[PDB]
Design a protein around this ligand. Sequence first.
Ligand SMILES: NC(=O)c1ccc[n+]([C@@H]2O[C@H](COP(=O)([O-])OP(=O)(O)OC[C@H]3O[C@@H](n4cnc5c(N)ncnc54)[C@H](O)[C@@H]3O)[C@@H](O)[C@H]2O)c1
Ligand SMILES: NC(=O)c1ccc[n+]([C@@H]2O[C@H](COP(=O)([O-])OP(=O)(O)OC[C@H]3O[C@@H](n4cnc5c(N)ncnc54)[C@H](O)[C@@H]3O)[C@@H](O)[C@H]2O)c1
Ligand SMILES: O=c1ccn([C@@H]2O[C@H](COP(=O)(O)OP(=O)(O)O)[C@@H](O)[C@H]2O)c(=O)[nH]1
Ligand SMILES: O=c1ccn([C@@H]2O[C@H](COP(=O)(O)OP(=O)(O)O)[C@@H](O)[C@H]2O)c(=O)[nH]1
Ligand code: NA
Ligand code: NA
Ligand code: NA
Ligand code: NA
Ligand code: NA
Ligand code: NA
Ligand code: NA
Ligand code: NA
Lengths: 338, 338
Amino acid sequence: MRVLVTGGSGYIGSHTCVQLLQNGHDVIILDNLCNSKRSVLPVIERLGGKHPTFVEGDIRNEALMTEILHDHAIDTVIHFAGLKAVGESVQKPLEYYDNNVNGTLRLISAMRAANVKNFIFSSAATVYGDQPKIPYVESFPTGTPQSPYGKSKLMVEQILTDLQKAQPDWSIALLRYFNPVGAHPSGDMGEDPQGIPNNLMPYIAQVAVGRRDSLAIFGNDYPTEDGTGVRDYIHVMDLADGHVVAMEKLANKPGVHIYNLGAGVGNSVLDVVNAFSKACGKPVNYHFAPRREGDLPAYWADASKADRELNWRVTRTLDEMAQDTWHWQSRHPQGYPD
Amino acid sequence: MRVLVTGGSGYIGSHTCVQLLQNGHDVIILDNLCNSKRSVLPVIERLGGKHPTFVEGDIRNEALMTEILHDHAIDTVIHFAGLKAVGESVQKPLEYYDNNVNGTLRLISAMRAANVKNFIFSSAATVYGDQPKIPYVESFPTGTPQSPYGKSKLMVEQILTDLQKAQPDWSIALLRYFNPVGAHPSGDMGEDPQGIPNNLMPYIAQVAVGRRDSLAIFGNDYPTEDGTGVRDYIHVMDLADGHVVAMEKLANKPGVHIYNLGAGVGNSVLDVVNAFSKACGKPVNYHFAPRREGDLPAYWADASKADRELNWRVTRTLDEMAQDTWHWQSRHPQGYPD
Ligand SMILES: NC(=O)c1ccc[n+]([C@@H]2O[C@H](COP(=O)([O-])OP(=O)(O)OC[C@H]3O[C@@H](n4cnc5c(N)ncnc54)[C@H](O)[C@@H]3O)[C@@H](O)[C@H]2O)c1
Ligand SMILES: NC(=O)c1ccc[n+]([C@@H]2O[C@H](COP(=O)([O-])OP(=O)(O)OC[C@H]3O[C@@H](n4cnc5c(N)ncnc54)[C@H](O)[C@@H]3O)[C@@H](O)[C@H]2O)c1
Ligand SMILES: O=c1ccn([C@@H]2O[C@H](COP(=O)(O)OP(=O)(O)O)[C@@H](O)[C@H]2O)c(=O)[nH]1
Ligand SMILES: O=c1ccn([C@@H]2O[C@H](COP(=O)(O)OP(=O)(O)O)[C@@H](O)[C@H]2O)c(=O)[nH]1
Ligand code: NA
Ligand code: NA
Ligand code: NA
Ligand code: NA
Ligand code: NA
Ligand code: NA
Ligand code: NA
Ligand code: NA
């Protein structure tokens, strides 16, 4: 298929592009480079085994999106582009609403204009809001996300749903990601956050690499087995694979196809820390800190639906997530070259 | 004060501009004319007793908004501009999200750029969603609006709330309108819908004027006194006045000030029909039809808060709403001149 992968040079998108190319699809990457570098492009091609076309540009530029769509006879679009720092979204709400809400709106508007009707959207577990019922199931009604970031995701899901109702021939997949971690097994592609990493894994990796002192564990008094927060970590390669399958199996299948993408099990901060120490050969330094504002104690995905409907399920383990992350971090301590 | 009134040439905005000018404020009207005509401008000035400046343009044009803001040293913005046909929003969701969600986002982004921090937003009762608890109170948590239109309003309220949190010096009023009806007492300014009117009052007026055959009453089996739908009708002049007061009393008062703007009492479709027949001197023709998709049986506003906090309450009656509407309709059967 001919697929436009917005945000394709970023963390999840890069790994997805590799898998797509390996499945022999024709890949057009669209990215504005606000959170990634052109240096990953060659890695993508080398690992994917085929050349993906790259276009530097912004999802907010509807005219350009329209042109790309038509120019490359795209059949389906995989929407990863956007801003995702939670804390920052609280501080700079407008930029989140613009890049995520308007960003998507301009993109799907461009699609309408070019007669493209197959879409995959990067959504998140945050859409569930404060849900006491875990694991989270697609059938659950959504709640109220606590941050501008979370809200922007849910708003897009709603807009996409209304669009589909209005243009019933569209196929739209709402992929709710849990906690993406890991890196390509080669160790030459992985997450390359700039500055202080907001997520657990990359932070741990930086402590392990010798860049940071200690991992601050946000809260140790939660109603969990070990008192630390529990989440559903999912390896980026498994996420990538789920994206190829969703794209191939849902194209031209009208509807709004919602799927949680997670392993279906929970792991605590300590469990993650422990796996990492194991992977890197030395105890990871850490300390307990107060609970992070807005955090839930525990949640994980109910991934039965994707298993059933798409025959997709995770295959990488927590140890692999940790080992792959350390391999990339250690092989490329400065991330992607400038 | 120096106020930019977006959508100022439309129904509610036109009447608001008149009241503003009567209070001697300097008024800049911004409208794209998609649902109003330049012909109302002179009426505004004549009834307002002062000249308002008019700029033809779109809220989506952030550069222009920014320029207007700075150029006119605006102190406060009253945001009426947007699309509001419910049924149509279901059919053309994107246009609603664009004009309302993006439209507002571009406008407040322009404000940020120009250092403007006083805003009034035209919100609606739809934000309450399916609320069994009536009357509706500002303290109630919001629900899930059933149409793209309703959703777009709630999304804006959320964006505005996050913005205020991020920029705590801002004063933002969320004015939730109930069922605006009526016309300026002169009979020379009023609602001028194009095509089939979606709201009850204008439809009734058109039946009364001899343009339409019969009023279709959507449903006669509701759990209400007379079986027809019950709402809180509020005269446009009262709404207008509430806007002047909100603007004058909340400017430079940091916070998100939410107020329901309604009369605080309910009236049925039949009650409205009856008042109109009374006003126009002849029985209004009507028939019973099936319930309109998504309609609630009954709802009205709890307007205590605005009374208490702003010392504002309605002063026009249902009969006046009907008489003023008929006077305008009858004096100007073709609406505003082309
Ligand atoms: N990483 C996670 O834990 C997590 C969890 C759920 C959802 N998501 C979502 O998945 C998607 C991908 O996440 P990621 O981890 O790969 O992040 P990422 O930052 O690595 O990738 C996003 C990419 O989008 C690009 N981009 C940002 N705004 C753009 C715009 N306006 N126009 C064009 N390009 C733009 C960035 O340059 C970057 O390459 C995002 O939508 C994110 O919100 C991620
Ligand atoms: N009339 C009601 O019953 C009702 C109830 C609640 C909320 N509202 C809201 O109150 C506001 C005013 O409603 P109204 O009855 O006066 O409607 P209206 O159509 O008469 O006024 C809206 C005005 O905005 C202008 N406009 C539309 N999109 C624009 C854009 N992108 N850029 C610039 N101008 C644009 C139109 O030309 C029109 O003059 C709207 O936001 C509406 O959703 C109205
Ligand atoms: O420096 C960090 C980052 C994360 N966490 C915890 O690790 C889990 C995952 O946090 P993350 O930000 O990666 O993702 P989230 O679950 O919030 O989407 C949660 O229980 C966080 O409290 C932590 O203790 N320290
Ligand atoms: O042609 C019409 C228009 C409206 N209504 C009813 O009148 C009330 C007000 O409808 P409207 O569309 O004006 O406003 P809403 O309350 O839906 O915001 C509701 O009970 C509608 O069902 C009706 O019976 N016929
Ligand atoms: Na096509
Ligand atoms: Na339709
Ligand atoms: Na960063
Ligand atoms: Na680097
Ligand atoms: Na100012
Ligand atoms: Na802040
Ligand atoms: Na119309
Ligand atoms: Na006319």
